[PDB]
Amino acid sequence: AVAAGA
């Protein structure tokens, strides 16, 4: 799981 942002 990879999540980037806001």
SS3 category, 6 = coil
Q: Which two tokens stand for residue 2?
A: 């990879």
Resolution as reported, in Å:
1.0
Instruction: List b or e across 1-6, with b for residues whose CB sees 16 or more CB atoms inside 10 angstroms.
Output: eeeeee
Residues sharing a CB contact under 8 Å with residue 4, sequence separation 6 or more, in sequence order: none
Cα separation, 3 vs 6, whole angstroms: 9
Give the technique used to solve this structure: electron diffraction
